[PDB]
Design a protein around this ligand. Sequence first.
Ligand SMILES: OC[C@H]1O[C@@](CO)(O[C@H]2O[C@H](CO)[C@@H](O)[C@H](O)[C@H]2O)[C@@H](O)[C@@H]1O
Ligand SMILES: OC[C@H]1O[C@@](CO)(O[C@H]2O[C@H](CO)[C@@H](O)[C@H](O)[C@H]2O)[C@@H](O)[C@@H]1O
Lengths: 246, 246
Amino acid sequence: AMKGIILAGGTGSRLYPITKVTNKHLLPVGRYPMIYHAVYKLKQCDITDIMIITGKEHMGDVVSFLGSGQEFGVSFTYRVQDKAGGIAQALGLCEDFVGNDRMVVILGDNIFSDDIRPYVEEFTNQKEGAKVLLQSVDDPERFGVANIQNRKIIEIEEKPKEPKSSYAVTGIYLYDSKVFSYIKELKPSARGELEITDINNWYLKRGVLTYNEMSGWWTDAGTHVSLQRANALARDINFGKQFNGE
Amino acid sequence: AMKGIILAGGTGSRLYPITKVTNKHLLPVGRYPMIYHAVYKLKQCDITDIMIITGKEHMGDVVSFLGSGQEFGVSFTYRVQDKAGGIAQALGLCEDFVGNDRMVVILGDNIFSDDIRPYVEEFTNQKEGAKVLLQSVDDPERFGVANIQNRKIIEIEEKPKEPKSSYAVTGIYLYDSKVFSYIKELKPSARGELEITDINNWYLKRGVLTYNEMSGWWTDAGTHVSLQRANALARDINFGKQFNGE
Ligand SMILES: OC[C@H]1O[C@@](CO)(O[C@H]2O[C@H](CO)[C@@H](O)[C@H](O)[C@H]2O)[C@@H](O)[C@@H]1O
Ligand SMILES: OC[C@H]1O[C@@](CO)(O[C@H]2O[C@H](CO)[C@@H](O)[C@H](O)[C@H]2O)[C@@H](O)[C@@H]1O
């Protein structure tokens, strides 16, 4: 089987004061809270076993919205992310939840048009490793950047000052269970310094990373400008009576 | 002196599921929570004694944002609005807070460009009564509508099926303390059926209602479409380090 993981932690400071009290991932994006989008993408892949990671202070509001998943035809489990570490350390918390299965990890503020199903199906037919999804963007300096040559990723660089390409590595990662070994057997405070790019480069060096360029639009929702854009793009998105309630 | 009142109650159902957990007035409108806007308009009028009315379930989140007002150079008092009654019954809760002073009542989801100061100054020079602010709109059927003839309001009608005019009566009302007598000495369940328009028509019949047409833009933020519009219009609004924190 295939497990789903949504990373909804973070300070959301980029968005203060709107996120003074509210968690970024509960802010509107179209007619739905940001996080709904991630839940919908996974549901459309028949990935119903989902783990939600978020901060201690915001778990109440997240759970109030998501509940057990009954109302969305899915099933949620929650873990708390602590003050220290970021996106990479948060993934470690899912080791037991995943077990020997495979993963689709979606950073909560990554909103996009594409059904991820086709990429999940390819990954399912991939003997081992990982898969990243790329999106060509205007300001690659803000993201992880894929350096592609002759249809192969030679290197990934986090926030490069002078980008080698414009292919941003989106926050949708497909991983096998070996990712936990890398993190798990790091270590120790080196795991606090770890970034998702390092994990991706680890698969790359081992020669088991694959990639696909996404078709539709994509955007993060972590700044006022990008949050607004996400709302413009999401205006007409409709998830059906199951997500419209109630 | 002049008191400020912000009515931030309501079910927010028009906006479900975004308002499943979050109160409508804490949703983003530009780089700030909706309610901040109302607080800023009053502050710019040197109206620092403000009462916030909201539902029982959402008071925690509202207070978490607004606090005592110290951080905004204002001063808040809060009262809870019950299940029954609406916008008119909520105003009754402010009788003691206001006392013998005058009021500026702002419905929390009414976002607009104009400084209300000029209208507050005119009202201050008005011997008694009330003052409404009008805005010419595209779909008057959704609002209270002012029927103007020879520069005088002949009548106000709530949600008219066949509007006599396109001047919508915006949710910014200036009242003297006599408004509480009308409500107070209604009554009884007739007060549950009461609408703000009735109050306005009461002043009108007594021949003490005045009006002004607003200059800039205005919009409610009570539907997905109008909430989005409000966000577009509010993109560049900046309230300063006092409201940007922290
Ligand atoms: O996803 C939001 C948040 O994640 C950060 C973490 O530093 O960047 C990660 O996600 C990006 C896509 O959102 C990737 O391009 C990047 O490689 C990854 O580190 C923040 O920059 C961003 O605000
Ligand atoms: O203000 C939001 C909310 O108020 C209602 C209450 O029925 O209408 C009131 O406010 C309007 C402006 O927002 C006025 O035009 C109207 O006269 C007044 O009743 C709702 O219609 C609206 O969603």
